[PDB]
Write a protein that binds this ligand. Structure first.
Ligand SMILES: *[C@@H]1O[C@H](CO)[C@@H](O[C@@H]2O[C@H](CO)[C@@H](O[C@@H]3O[C@H](CO)[C@@H](O[C@@H]4O[C@H](CO)[C@@H](O)[C@H](O)[C@H]4NC(C)=O)[C@H](O)[C@H]3NC(C)=O)[C@H](O)[C@H]2NC(C)=O)[C@H](O)[C@H]1NC(C)=O
Ligand SMILES: *[C@@H]1O[C@H](CO)[C@@H](O[C@@H]2O[C@H](CO)[C@@H](O[C@@H]3O[C@H](CO)[C@@H](O)[C@H](O)[C@H]3NC(C)=O)[C@H](O)[C@H]2NC(C)=O)[C@H](O)[C@H]1NC(C)=O
Ligand SMILES: *[C@@H]1O[C@H](CO)[C@@H](O[C@@H]2O[C@H](CO)[C@@H](O)[C@H](O)[C@H]2NC(C)=O)[C@H](O)[C@H]1NC(C)=O
Ligand SMILES: *[C@@H]1O[C@H](CO)[C@@H](O[C@@H]2O[C@H](CO)[C@@H](O)[C@H](O)[C@H]2NC(C)=O)[C@H](O)[C@H]1NC(C)=O
Ligand SMILES: *[C@@H]1O[C@H](CO)[C@@H](O[C@@H]2O[C@H](CO)[C@@H](O)[C@H](O)[C@H]2NC(C)=O)[C@H](O)[C@H]1NC(C)=O
Ligand SMILES: *[C@@H]1O[C@H](CO)[C@@H](O)[C@H](O)[C@H]1NC(C)=O
Ligand SMILES: *[C@@H]1O[C@H](CO)[C@@H](O)[C@H](O)[C@H]1NC(C)=O
Ligand SMILES: [Ca+2]
Length: 948
């Protein structure tokens, strides 16, 4: 091949022939003057990070404090009404009136509501009464249910007062310990219905304090058969009652005690850790001699570790067995002489073995005894231990009445991602005399109010910041409360197979790329500190195909109301923004005609961003429909805009004149420029003005400019960015659409560098290959590629048919050597909110690894020898300056008859990372500071064996 000097000269002409075309046709240099000729039409305003985070954090406190006041109002009225209730035994004479949610009966009258449609909720609701959900295995009309349906009727007059005071109030619910849930407003319930209010995460978190469960499983020979698969089901059903604040481990014993999994100590019991225990429990076999002394010694020695992260709270042992004659009093007299550990015992299956020793362990230690004779008793009996664990919480008094917020989860009544407040309700009947204390140690139920994530996202406006700026808040666990990467889909825990139940818990470090600085930031935010940090990091693009570096200025502050912490990611070139200032109406009238669809023939195809201009307008998925309503809204409404905020209206209208000016003044001068398929401009305001109206059919970008991959990618780079096309019918037209070449504009007003908009062209392939010719050879092939290894041209004209495909998919030998020569670095990450086709053993959820490639260093010239084996291939690569393109000079593939394994850049389904070694060095976290257990006044004289 020609020497380096010849290649550099040859590629310099290509650089000078491609940059010039994009520089001139698009008009980036001439758009700055437009933004600099009309300075007095706007003004620049600062974006100070410190106030922005603290303003939003204070607003989040108020929103989370309004619902706290609504919770204490409901808990107070529920307590004082239950005391006044007089227990009855007949209801035929006095029929209770209520609306049953699950319907299309003597002893209880039903209601027929109006069910008008309403916003906020996505269903038909009725603000006149509260609906009741009764589980399908709980019989309405019983004395327990009917009595609960009576005294839980004064709650409706408190439900309306909360809604009238806070019109933005979402579901207010009362989860009763009987089993029925009463929620407001009334709506019909959402195959077979298996919903139980007592098993929901918001109910379990308010019914007891965090725990340190440790399951003991009897895997001796006597449990083989039916009673072994009941034990396996019961243990799995018990693990569903553990949140991320609880730490669990599963062990087994048959003349020898050992763990069922790879953990060997208490683990955080998140979604991934619980799936490992569920997989290991299903693979146990029943054989050997039972030995309770060695099984319990192992359990007691695992609850006394204190070397790892724990909950430092309720320490319980759940023993799943059948029966026996051994009491093991010496183990209990040695390990817990002061009874710091509760023991819960379960007798699974139908058998003739002694249960006396089993019931004895549950009475000496302050626990309970449960019986599971069939598969139908598994669900009820595996959630009743929370009644015992709540005894020290009730005796606490008003100290236990602390509002708690759950993890982000999906609402049962489909409403999106929500978090729920929580407040337990105590049975305080006969409190004046304080004499009964027999059933007053249990909670009546749990109060709860839902807060949608859209409500929180409204308190953190994002349109004043650049498209690369965003807010995010995290729990004191690392889980993000709000984040741009968080999606309303369940997370995956492995590879699915075919033969709302779990929270959407996504860590902050698993939402974006993980750095050493970000780990230090995450720990500081968890502790509840304030600070800032400016650093360089590589940020993934919108489409998981590119990675680019930039400067960020993470600023975080704590939220005083709760344990959350809020941070704002503000990059450079975003500390100032253009705020439109207007005092007339002729400019608005003049700019209104620019967006008329009938004028698109001469003004270009104009898009529009579906933002919240005001509540009267309706956001739709059809831009033409929503644009049509927008243009006949500025005029049909008075310019003062009593209900529409002028900040957003002035923003789009002002850019409607700037962008149209470029179209008319310059883009209208030339209508045919070589092989330019389309000229476009995307701005911060929200209008996109692709000039050829016919070419607008090929535009397949998001109408909202903030969610455009090329917009964010071009902002960081101070050069031209080439966007590779898609492949395999992912988009319409490979050569019928062109190659996008973005370019961000930059202006200086008063010494402040700003990036309002970007422009670009869509160069045709046919007009591009002819320039590259100066061809179908069988000796060597020359192509160009992009900061990611995607093909844009070809020499053999066989790779031309696959423009926009990863380079490693067609010539892995050279591609793999490029990584080894340090020109194309890469980093991999896991995507947990992904959907994939199932395997074999209906697209389920799974973890898919992602790989992105990028330039390693700033070196321009690359050359070397590729030794594929008994061959000699020598290449030469050169970087096209002012862009992200590189040109290589390598021989043909046919010279060396070597075909190595293909290199793939796509979402490959995986199952990692391995949690076996993740628990060895877990991420930093901070547990709750409250703890309620081992109360002296606790009765604990009511186990399940004394009665029987
Ligand atoms: C909050 O706590 C209070 C008390 O602290 C609690 O009110 C008490 O409710 C029970 C019912 O569960 C009342 O018991 C009365 O006396 C006996 C005992 O149950 C009942 O007679 C039979 O009992 C058996 C149980 O073994 C039952 O199967 C049978 O159906 C009953 N009836 C028969 C055989 O005909 C009485 O029926 C029952 N009711 C009376 C006498 O009116 C206590 O008297 C209640 N205590 C007080 C002080 O009122 C209340 O339920 C708790 N809150 C909630 C939500 O449960
Ligand atoms: C448990 O079951 C019953 C279902 O409605 C309710 O009992 C009814 O309570 C009403 C209000 O207390 C009574 O109406 C008034 O009662 C007062 C008694 O102090 C008197 O003025 C009159 O009896 C009556 N007033 C009128 C008719 O103008 C009902 O009489 C009474 N029904 C029966 C059969 O006793 C309970 O309210 C209900 N509990 C809850 C919490 O809703
Ligand atoms: C959360 O509360 C803390 C105090 O508990 C607030 O800290 C204040 O910070 C300002 C700015 O330096 C000081 O002038 C105040 O004196 C501080 N408060 C106190 C009580 O000393 C913090 O601002 C609060 N966070 C938000 C977002 O409002
Ligand atoms: C952590 O676990 C170890 C092992 O169970 C505890 O015991 C120590 O073990 C190491 C290694 O043999 C040595 O330091 C001593 O033999 C043991 N005692 C001490 C005081 O270290 C250990 O106590 C646990 N806790 C800590 C903080 O190490
Ligand atoms: C992203 O990729 C970079 C480059 O491939 C990696 O960071 C490099 O890691 C090696 C090994 O520790 C260091 O010798 C280099 O100095 C690093 N490059 C830097 C810091 O620019 C790593 O895979 C990713 N970078 C992260 C996670 O920060
Ligand atoms: C509710 O919260 C808002 C701020 O989000 C606050 O201004 C208001 O006072 C609170 N209370 C009511 C009744 O609106
Ligand atoms: C699409 O499937 C694979 C994936 O890229 C590709 O190799 C194949 O050639 C494509 N098939 C068609 C018909 O385009
Ligand atoms: Ca046995």
């Amino acid at each position: 091949f020609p020497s380096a000097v010849t290649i550099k000269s040859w590629v310099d002409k290509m650089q000078e022939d491609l940059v010039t075309l994009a520089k001139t046709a698009s008009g980036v240099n001439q758009l700055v003057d437009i933004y600099e000729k009309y300075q007095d039409l706007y003004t620049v305003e600062p974006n100070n990070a410190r106030q922005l985070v603290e303003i939003a954090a204070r607003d989040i406190e108020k929103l989370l404090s309004n619902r706290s006041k609504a919770l204490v109002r409901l808990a107070l009225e529920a307590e004082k009404v239950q005391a006044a209730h007089q227990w009855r035994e007949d209801f035929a004479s006095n029929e209770v009136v209520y609306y049953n949610a699950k319907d299309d009966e003597p002893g209880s009258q039903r209601i027929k509501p109006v069910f008008i449609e309403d916003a906020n909720f996505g269903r038909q609701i009725s603000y006149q009464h509260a609906a009741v959900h009764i589980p399908t295995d709980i019989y309405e009309g019983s004395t327990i249910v009917l009595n609960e349906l009576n005294w839980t009727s004064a709650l409706d007059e408190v439900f309306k007062k909360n809604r009238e005071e806070d019109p933005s109030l979402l579901w207010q619910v009362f989860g009763s310990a009987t089993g029925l849930a009463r929620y407001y407003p009334a709506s019909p319930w959402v195959k077979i219905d298996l919903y139980d209010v007592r098993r929901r995460p918001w109910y379990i978190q308010g019914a007891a304090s965090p725990k340190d469960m440790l399951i003991l499983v009897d895997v001796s020979g006597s449990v083989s058969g039916l009673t072994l698969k009941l034990i396996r089901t019961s243990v799995s059903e018990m693990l569903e009652t553990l949140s991320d604040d609880d730490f669990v481990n599963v062990a087994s014993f048959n003349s020898n005690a050992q763990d069922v999994s790879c953990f060997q100590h208490l683990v955080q019991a998140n979604v991934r850790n619980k799936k490992v225990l569920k997989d290991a429990v299903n693979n146990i076999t029943a054989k050997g001699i039972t030995d309770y002394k060695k099984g319990f010694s192992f359990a007691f020695e695992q609850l006394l570790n204190y070397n790892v992260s724990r909950a430092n709270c309720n320490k319980i042992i759940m023993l799943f067995t059948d029966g026996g004659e051994e009491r093991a009093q010496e183990i209990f007299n040695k390990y817990n002489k002061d009874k710091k550990v509760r023991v819960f015992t379960f007798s699974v299956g139908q058998h003739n073995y002694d249960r006396g020793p089993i019931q004895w362990m549950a009475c000496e230690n302050k626990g309970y005894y449960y019986e599971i004779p069939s598969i139908g008793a598994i669900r009820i009996n595996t959630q009743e231990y929370l009644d015992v664990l709540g005894r020290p919480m009730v005796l606490a008094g008003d100290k236990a009445k602390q509002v708690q917020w759950t993890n982000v989860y999906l609402d049962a009544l489909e409403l999106g991602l929500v978090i729920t407040g929580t407040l337990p309700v105590f049975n305080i009947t006969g409190q004046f005399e304080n004499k009964t204390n027999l059933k007053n140690q249990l909670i009546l139920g749990v109060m709860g109010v839902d807060v949608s994530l859209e409500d929180i996202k409204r308190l953190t406006p994002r349109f004043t910041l650049c498209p690369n700026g965003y807010y995010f808040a995290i729990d004191p666990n690392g889980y993000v409360l709000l984040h741009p990467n968080l999606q309303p889909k369940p997370i995956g825990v492995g590879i699915p197979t075919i033969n709302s139940q779990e929270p959407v818990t996504l860590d902050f470090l698993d939402a974006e790329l993980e750095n050493d600085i970000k780990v230090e930031i995450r720990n500081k935010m968890i502790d509840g500190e304030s600070g800032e940090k400016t650093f360089r990091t590589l940020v993934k693009s919108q489409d998981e195909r590119y990675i680019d570096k930039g400067n960020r200025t993470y600023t975080w502050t704590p939220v005083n109301g709760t344990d959350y912490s809020l941070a704002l990611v503000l990059p450079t070139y975003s500390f100032y923004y253009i705020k439109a200032k207007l005092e007339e109406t002729i400019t608005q009238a003049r700019y209104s005609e620019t967006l008329k669809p009938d004028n698109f023939e001469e003004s270009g195809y104009t898009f529009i961003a579906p933002r919240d201009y005001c509540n009267d307008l309706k956001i739709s998925d059809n831009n033409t429909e929503f644009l049509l309503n927008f243009n006949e809204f500025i005029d049909r409404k008075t310019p003062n805009n009593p209900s529409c905020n002028a900040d957003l209206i002035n923003r789009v209208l002002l850019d409607a004149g700037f962008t149209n000016e470029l179209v008319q003044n310059y883009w209208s001068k030339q209508k045919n420029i070589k092989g330019v398929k389309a000229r476009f401009v995307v701005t911060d305001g929200g209008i996109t003005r692709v000039y050829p109206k016919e070419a607008g059919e090929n535009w397949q970008e998001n109408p909202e400019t903030y969610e455009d991959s090329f917009y964010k990618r071009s902002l960081d780079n101070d050069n031209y960015v080439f966007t590779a096309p898609y492949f395999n019918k992912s988009g319409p037209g490979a050569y019928e659409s062109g190659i996008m070449v973005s370019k961000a504009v930059e202006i200086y007003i008063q010494g402040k560098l700003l990036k309002p908009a970007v422009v670009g062209i869509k160069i045709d392939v046919n007009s591009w290959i002819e320039n590259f010719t100066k061809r179908n050879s069988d000796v060597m092939d020359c192509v160009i590629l992009d900061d990611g290894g995607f093909l844009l041209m070809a020499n053999h004209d066989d790779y031309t048919n696959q423009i926009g495909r990863f380079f490693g998919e067609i010539d892995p030998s050279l591609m793999r050597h490029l990584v080894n020569i340090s020109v194309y670095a890469f980093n991999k990450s896991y995507d947990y909110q992904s959907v994939c086709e199932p395997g074999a053993a209906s697209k389920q959820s799974c973890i898919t690894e992602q790989t992105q490639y990028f330039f390693d260093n700033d070196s321009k010239s690359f050359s070397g020898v590729l030794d594929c084996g008994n061959c000699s291939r020598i290449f030469h690569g050169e970087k096209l300056m002012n862009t992200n393109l590189i040109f290589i000079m390598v021989e043909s593939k046919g010279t060396c008859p070597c075909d190595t394994r293909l290199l793939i850049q796509a979402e490959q389904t995986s199952d990692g990372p391995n949690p076996c070694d993740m628990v060895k060095q877990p991420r930093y976290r901070k547990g709750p500071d409250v703890c309620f257990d081992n109360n002296v006044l606790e009765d604990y004289t009511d186990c399940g064996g004394v009665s029987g």
